């Protein structure tokens, strides 16, 4: 159940309820995970972060190669990874390490984790989902059209064929009865196919929609995006993949998109950087100017890193390649990014999102 | 006589086992105690809150590595190691002369101190006893160790190094101007030579330092020689001061050395997880579908949250994450072991604890290590 609080300038402020006691705020982000962990963080250290989203994103590409063990385990991937009470959305691809292109056919789609190719027909994909048992899952889809009208037309038909076949298999699956399929809008950069994908996918009883293939982010694709969301029903959530940088997030929110991946703060962490942009841009902690800097990463930040550690210490930890550097940067970068999403929702409540957008852009 | 930093809260009637308390500037430490290296925990992503939650109240700093990065001047500006690394409990640092120093980086020792080599025929660096104290003063650790002349080794060098360590002890004592703020420990030398070690014990205990460490063991020596030198050392070190046995950390070694009178211990990735029966090698295929934790009765975060199967999967597919979880559990095991040892001494049931520990670890007395059976028998503990 998606209930809107208000819609101002195309931006949807609301909550998704009955997830069946959980609620998720929109616009919002999903907690980013890799191989079933928030990167560099534990259950304990995740609990300390403020504003952790109500739903976490899992990636089939990092979990599909563990199918045999998960099927033996039977109780689902959330329980397997030690987060039995969390909500999980399982996407097809990882947005940071998506693997090689060109392996999509009318019959299967392939993903890569640590090891070898995992080729998934519809039945294999659904068999994997029966072991994972996520709360939400992206349907098998062809996202490589814009990676030619012919290629874009095929991505819509393949994705509609996958969708219908997966819905049929879900009807016969005891365990996937409580799981929600997310329809996937394809069509690449051909306007006619985007609309057809949008209109036809909305005819199917999906729990929501994934806007695939908008990664960058052109103004052409932003116009495709708004053209697509105008065709989708208002009472279902709109997810988008590969869009996480703050400026791009705001452009998509203005065009009716609700839920975003949070891989951007992870990318910042992996390059040894800390988010510093005001939301009411980043700093590189390897720089020698931080060697004697005993300020926190962000003055006034409430995260465990900033309240208890210095730039100088994090600089040292990076120079000696200690995993604690990535722990502390990840805690701060997630806390900062989740605080940014809190400020978006507050700005929508107060009708000041335009002002927040200029504050963000200013630091870009 | 200087004020004593230790008190004994219980002693085993038959054996040498002691339960004590060390009153240190950053808090009281219960003994016997195992002291992990702090920077080894931070290398594996362990925060101060996590290490505190495992029960750790004192950890080691390696002075040589600290002296390279970030260096003593930066640590001084950061108001000491406690401030720099956000650690509110106790720290113990070594002299910086030998621990974790490659022999490729060391020139020969002279009376003036230790000499470090720099790459490609560069200029050498001297670390005198006085400079070692000055560096550890800047670190601000709660316990500091003398500079000693460490040797691995037979012939006259052992006696020569032992006597130089006595002379350097006196120089460290003279240089250490603030015994109210940091506690300097002497380090007993003499190798496996009973006569040299006896002389070192007799001479170093004439110095009124607050504690004594036992050096030069944990080399290649036999186990027979090892435990006899530990027992010789504890028989001559003052009862009313702590005994720190360096470089001993295997569980069986720890338990036996507590029985011989030792109070403090230290010791430095293959998928091994410590358990009461020894270790589990979680990379083995048998754990791929083992959905139990490493140890159902381990209170560590890893055992509350994760199965052997999950850790096995991560050891292959996300190894860095696995190493965090395993390091947390392995430190937890060491701290729990020493906590269980101390409880048994307080409840006057240490010989029973040893018997149960050995039976769980090995089985029948005939499967226990012979050196351990003999060493324990020497303090009245029969298996
Ligand atoms: Zn912070
Ligand atoms: Zn454990």
UniProtKB/Swiss-Prot annotation, chain A:
Cofactor note: Binds 1 zinc ion per subunit.
Its membrane topology: Peripheral membrane protein
Cofactor(s) this protein requires: Zn(2+)
Pfam families: TGT
Protein localization: Cytoplasm; Mitochondrion outer membrane
GO biological process: tRNA-guanine transglycosylation
Keyword vocabulary terms for this entry: Cytoplasm, Membrane, Metal-binding, Mitochondrion, Mitochondrion outer membrane, tRNA processing, Zinc
Entry binding sites for Zn(2+): 301, 303, 306, 332
Tissue and organ distribution: Expressed in brain, heart, kidney, liver, lung, skeletal muscle, spleen and testis.
GO MF, any single term: tRNA-guanosine(34) queuine transglycosylase activity
GO cellular component, one term: mitochondrion
Keyword Protein biosynthesis: no
Family of this protein: Belongs to the queuine tRNA-ribosyltransferase family. QTRT2 subfamily.
Quaternary structure, from the entry: Heterodimer of a catalytic subunit QTRT1 and an accessory subunit QTRT2.
Function (record text): Non-catalytic subunit of the queuine tRNA-ribosyltransferase (TGT) that catalyzes the base-exchange of a guanine (G) residue with queuine (Q) at position 34 (anticodon wobble position) in tRNAs with GU(N) anticodons (tRNA-Asp, -Asn, -His and -Tyr), resulting in the hypermodified nucleoside queuosine (7-(((4,5-cis-dihydroxy-2-cyclopenten-1-yl)amino)methyl)-7-deazaguanosine).
Name of this chain's protein: Queuine tRNA-ribosyltransferase accessory subunit 2
Species this chain originates from: Mus musculus (Mouse)
Swiss-Prot record, chain B:
Positions of the catalytic residues: 94, 266
Molecular function terms from GO: metal ion binding; protein heterodimerization activity; protein homodimerization activity; tRNA-guanosine(34) queuine transglycosylase activity
EC number: 2.4.2.64
Domain of life of the source: Eukaryota
Recorded catalytic activity of this chain's protein: guanosine(34) in tRNA + queuine = queuosine(34) in tRNA + guanine
Principal location: cytoplasm
Tissue expression summary: Expressed in brain, heart, kidney, liver, ling, skeletal muscle, spleen and testis.
Positions of the UniProt region annotated as RNA binding: 247-253
GO biological process, one term: tRNA-guanine transglycosylation
Pfam families: TGT
GO cellular component: cytoplasm; cytoplasmic side of mitochondrial outer membrane; nucleus; protein-containing complex; tRNA-guanine transglycosylase complex
Cofactor(s) listed in the protein's UniProt record: Zn(2+)
Keywords: Acetylation, Cytoplasm, Glycosyltransferase, Membrane, Metal-binding, Mitochondrion, Mitochondrion outer membrane, Nucleus, Phosphoprotein, Transferase, tRNA processing, Zinc
InterPro entries in the record: TGT, TGT-like_sf, tRNA_ribo_trans-like
Phenotype reported upon loss of the gene: Mice are viable and fertile but display cognitive defects, characterized by learning and memory deficits. Female mice are more severely affected than males. In the hippocampus, stalling of ribosomes on queuosine(34)-decoded codons is observed, as well as a global imbalance in translation elongation speed between codons that engage in weak and strong interactions with their cognate anticodons.
Phosphoserine carried by residues: 128
Binding site for Zn(2+): 298, 300, 303, 329
Topology of the protein relative to the lipid bilayer: Peripheral membrane protein
Binding site for queuine: 94-98, 148, 189, 216
Assembly information from the UniProt record: Heterodimer of a catalytic subunit QTRT1 and an accessory subunit QTRT2.
Protein task: Catalytic subunit of the queuine tRNA-ribosyltransferase (TGT) that catalyzes the base-exchange of a guanine (G) residue with queuine (Q) at position 34 (anticodon wobble position) in tRNAs with GU(N) anticodons (tRNA-Asp, -Asn, -His and -Tyr), resulting in the hypermodified nucleoside queuosine (7-(((4,5-cis-dihydroxy-2-cyclopenten-1-yl)amino)methyl)-7-deazaguanosine). Catalysis occurs through a double-displacement mechanism. The nucleophile active site attacks the C1' of nucleotide 34 to detach the guanine base from the RNA, forming a covalent enzyme-RNA intermediate.
Family membership: Belongs to the queuine tRNA-ribosyltransferase family.
HAMAP family for this protein: Q_tRNA_Tgt
Protein name: Queuine tRNA-ribosyltransferase catalytic subunit 1
Provenance organism: Mus musculus (Mouse)
Annotated gene: Qtrt1
